[PDB]
Write a protein that binds this ligand. Sequence first.
Ligand code: HEM
Ligand code: HEM
Ligand code: HEM
Ligand code: HEM
Ligand SMILES: [Mn+2]
Ligand SMILES: [Mn+2]
Ligand SMILES: [Mn+2]
Ligand SMILES: [Mn+2]
Ligand SMILES: [Mn+2]
Ligand SMILES: [Mn+2]
Ligand SMILES: [Mn+2]
Ligand SMILES: [Mn+2]
Ligand SMILES: [Mn+2]
Ligand SMILES: [Mn+2]
Ligand SMILES: [Mn+2]
Ligand SMILES: [Mn+2]
Ligand SMILES: [Mn+2]
Ligand SMILES: [Mn+2]
Lengths: 158, 158, 158, 158, 158, 158, 158
Amino acid sequence: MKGDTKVINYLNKLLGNELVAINQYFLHARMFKNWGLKRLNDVEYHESIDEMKHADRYIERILFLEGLPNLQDLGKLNIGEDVEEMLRSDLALELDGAKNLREAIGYADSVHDYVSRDMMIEILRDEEGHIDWLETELDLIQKMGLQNYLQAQIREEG
Amino acid sequence: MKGDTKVINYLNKLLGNELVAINQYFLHARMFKNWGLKRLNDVEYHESIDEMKHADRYIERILFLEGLPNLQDLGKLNIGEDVEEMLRSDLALELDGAKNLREAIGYADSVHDYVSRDMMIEILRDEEGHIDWLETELDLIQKMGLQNYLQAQIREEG
Amino acid sequence: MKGDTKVINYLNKLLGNELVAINQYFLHARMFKNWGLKRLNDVEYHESIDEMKHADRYIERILFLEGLPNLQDLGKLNIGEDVEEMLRSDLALELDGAKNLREAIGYADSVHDYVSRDMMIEILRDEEGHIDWLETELDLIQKMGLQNYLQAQIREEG
Amino acid sequence: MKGDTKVINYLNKLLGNELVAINQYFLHARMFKNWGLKRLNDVEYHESIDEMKHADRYIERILFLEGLPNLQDLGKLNIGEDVEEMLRSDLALELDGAKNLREAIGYADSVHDYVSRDMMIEILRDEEGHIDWLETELDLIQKMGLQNYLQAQIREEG
Amino acid sequence: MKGDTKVINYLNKLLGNELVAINQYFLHARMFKNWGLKRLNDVEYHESIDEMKHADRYIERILFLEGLPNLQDLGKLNIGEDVEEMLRSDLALELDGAKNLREAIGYADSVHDYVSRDMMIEILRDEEGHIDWLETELDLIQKMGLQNYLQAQIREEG
Amino acid sequence: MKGDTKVINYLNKLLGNELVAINQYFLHARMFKNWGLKRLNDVEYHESIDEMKHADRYIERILFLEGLPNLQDLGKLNIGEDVEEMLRSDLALELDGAKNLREAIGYADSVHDYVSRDMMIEILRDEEGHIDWLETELDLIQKMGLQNYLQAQIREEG
Amino acid sequence: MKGDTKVINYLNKLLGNELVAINQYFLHARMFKNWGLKRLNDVEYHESIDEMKHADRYIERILFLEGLPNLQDLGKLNIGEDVEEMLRSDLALELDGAKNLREAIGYADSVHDYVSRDMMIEILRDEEGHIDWLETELDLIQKMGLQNYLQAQIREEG
Ligand code: HEM
Ligand code: HEM
Ligand code: HEM
Ligand code: HEM
Ligand SMILES: [Mn+2]
Ligand SMILES: [Mn+2]
Ligand SMILES: [Mn+2]
Ligand SMILES: [Mn+2]
Ligand SMILES: [Mn+2]
Ligand SMILES: [Mn+2]
Ligand SMILES: [Mn+2]
Ligand SMILES: [Mn+2]
Ligand SMILES: [Mn+2]
Ligand SMILES: [Mn+2]
Ligand SMILES: [Mn+2]
Ligand SMILES: [Mn+2]
Ligand SMILES: [Mn+2]
Ligand SMILES: [Mn+2]
């Protein structure tokens, strides 16, 4: 069912946001794992899987609406070399994406694409959850100190 | 079965004590949870449920005795902005309530309301248990330090 | 994630609406139970639990958004001394709250807080369900008469 | 297998009778449910499902016989605004349909379509069952009175 | 709970859209079945059941809001005499209905009926799914040819 | 219980019709099987078993009524050398038999043998089912073509 | 354990090869799915998951060897607009990658990194399996024709 170019553009931009996030979260996961921080690897890994699923949602929506998903343009990945740094990159990225999400959600309403705006609000509720975990983690390093924080990552929780 | 105004007054005052406690414990629970302190959220949450049940006990007793429960007057909640502070508010509150409980228990005996005094001693045995957990927690922060204490709350026990 | 004062104000006002409702529904439940009306106690009790859960939803949202839940101000509880009267208080209260809910939902959209507006519409769909049960009950008293209606409450349904 | 126009006409008229009945029974069901009369909603709902199945039987028979089912013409639905009234509409409708059924059954025999007359007698045995329930219900209102009758509908039987 | 005439009008128009769809999908189902196309009958049959459930949703919403569902006016059913033709009717119909759905969803928001707009977006997400299956089917006939397409329908999938 | 010569004659003629059908359907079944058309063999085989059971029904009825079943006269079997041809023989035969069935059913009524007419209408409902499968098959060859139709028979369905 | 720059370069180039393959296979999967070709979507989807796992293998090896995985550079995705075309892109890509794999395997031996060459030969045995499926598919279109081939994809195998 063909449906509104602008909507398909927002969708493709949002997809791009996802693509950079799966890559950055996956490398971070494996960097943490590598350091022996099992808890951080377990969490960052599943968020990457979440992003992966967010992306498939867009790809399918774009295809229904009769557009062509763009999986060719990749964004800048800001990796970071220490955990406190890595986590902040993750947060900044999440924040930018949420911003794009709000822009896109308002427009779909204007244009009456309520199902595209329904899906996006679902995805935004998720992002805001990634945002909460990162914020909490960053404060914990601040509150218990880095060495206690590091010792607290060597075994994954349950 | 109508039964002694003074008793119904003590019961209503005690109920009020409970009402402020459910509110303060519930906000504290969610403040802890929010900070990522799962263990503190789990405990403070169940104490709120305990208080909630204490209250239903009073409401029913007052109704049997033919009085009208007072759920309109709320007390001062002293929240606190740091855990050590939050826990001390909880303790002080518990202490005040226990004091009222003893006053009320002695009077029911004078007046021969042994079933109201039976129920209250049950509730007091419970309060004294809330009092013990808080005292132990506050000393632990004192003994292992705050950062170790904080690291020790990030996963709930079993 | 800090987010819009006005939204946090609406959220806190809505929470207050909930707090008065849990109290009024719980006292009503126990008044009915006390009279031997098992069916009315069972229903009014679970609605109180629903309101209780609505409240926890707000408390957590306010905390995420970085505001402070207000559990200190309690509203006027209009109890009532006969069932027809009690049920009408419940209805009026529900109606007022729904009104606040619509005001708050429209504003979150303006401000782009779609996740806060998502949660609220969920809670509103629930309120409108409480509103339907009360309306039906009040008409049944009108249609079968009060004594038949009363006889119809002495055993809880399933 | 092409087979007798007149038979296909009777079949289509009978189908029409069914279509109006599914609609009237379904609205009535939901009107009762809405009023809190669970027993009346449960029964009227299943009769609607019975009519629904009667219709599919005709649609398939018409198609075999090589005719075209007519699902375009809808009859007059006589709703009614009170239960005694609603039930009487249901009865009248059933009565009219049974009358058409007998006309159609006699003709299929003349014409030797014994399988069409076999199916119809099955459907008629069913109608006469809908007719019996309605008659019994209407008399019960007459015998115990409307308020007792109404109180007797608020919980579905088993 | 009485609520906005215009909303109840849109709801009734939408219900009408559903009614024509259940009828057209059900006849099509049985026409396919009749031809020996089991796969097409199985799918078209369940979509009819979906529409049937969509309708019950409206009927109940209209009744809550205190309006009267209109099950008297039936729309034009455009049947079709060959499968490619039948499927295109189904698609066109779906498309028209989706259009009405968007009009109605925007208005409920204006008027603040968020629960009616919630339900409708759910129903629209469904329609868009019926729309996707039909589009895919029509292209498959185009891509493998009609005879291969026909041979591919004689046994239902799983 | 001795009962009406004419009825016993119709019964014996009908039995004869069955006997030729079991033979033709069984040879056809095995011819199809032989060619590797599993689906056609499976179906034609079970119809032969159905006819076989129809026959036993007559044999027993004739014996009760005190007549002697005639299993000595066999009819003309029209085999056919290609599937389209084979299926058409089967159809023609079925059609002739149904015709005899209607003649016999009307007469039993005249004569009041309602149990013989009951059994026969059961058997006729079955024949009309054999008639429907053959008609559908013959059209499918017409609609998808013979080679696609043939490829569609090499594995039995379920 | 730090280990040979050249090896880490080959590893990173190979990882890049994987990254483009996951993207192209995933879009193709969803394009096929979209067209209603369930079998092609199921297969192309799992190959994408295989590539995804190949990539994680490299990322971890690079990290052990003390290099930094490069997830920033994405290659040219050659999509294609028809299935025959899409499958050929997939094949060409696979072929190029296998070529790089052989170059890298020979060098690790020279340099004595037998564990890196062990892992790579495992991954190459896999690629050669992706290569075999594509070759077989492309010939099947050639041998049965495209319409028969297309009809053969509408239900996933098992
Ligand atoms: C367009 C890019 C990609 C897309 C859309 C994508 C999509 C997916 C999806 C939807 C799944 C299945 C989700 C589920 O299990 O429910 C999956 C699984 C996974 N992905 Fe990705 N992915 C991509 C890139 C990546 C990257 C860069 C890596 C590896 C470096 C990766 C590693 C994995 C792994 C390891 C799994 C799970 C395997 C399993 O448990 O069976 N993905 N991917
Ligand atoms: C007069 C005030 C209140 C009364 C008497 C009351 C009473 C109760 C009771 C007796 C229960 C059931 C206990 C059990 O599970 O055995 C309950 C459950 C609970 N209450 Fe309250 N409550 C009140 C205020 C609060 C507040 C302020 C909150 C929320 C902010 C709250 C949140 C809950 C929750 C979440 C549960 C458990 C829900 C579940 O697990 O199903 N309550 N309450
Ligand atoms: C206002 C019109 C109608 C309404 C609202 C309606 C509603 C329904 C509903 C809600 C159900 C149950 C859904 C479920 O199983 O979860 C049902 C079942 C069904 N309907 Fe309808 N229906 C209508 C018209 C039709 C027509 C025209 C036909 C028949 C020609 C039909 C045939 C059926 C059948 C066969 C079933 C399923 C029976 C079973 O599996 O027990 N319906 N209908
Ligand atoms: C060319 C003539 C016929 C052939 C080759 C034939 C063949 C068969 C075969 C192979 C079976 C299945 C055997 C099994 O169950 O393993 C069968 C079953 C049977 N036959 Fe015949 N038959 C013929 C004539 C007759 C006649 C004249 C009658 C009836 C008057 C008859 C009555 C039955 C019955 C009742 C069964 C068993 C039904 C069951 O238990 O499901 N057959 N026949
Ligand atoms: Mn995401
Ligand atoms: Mn995220
Ligand atoms: Mn207590
Ligand atoms: Mn306590
Ligand atoms: Mn609420
Ligand atoms: Mn409520
Ligand atoms: Mn009927
Ligand atoms: Mn009926
Ligand atoms: Mn629908
Ligand atoms: Mn639809
Ligand atoms: Mn027979
Ligand atoms: Mn036969
Ligand atoms: Mn690979
Ligand atoms: Mn590969």
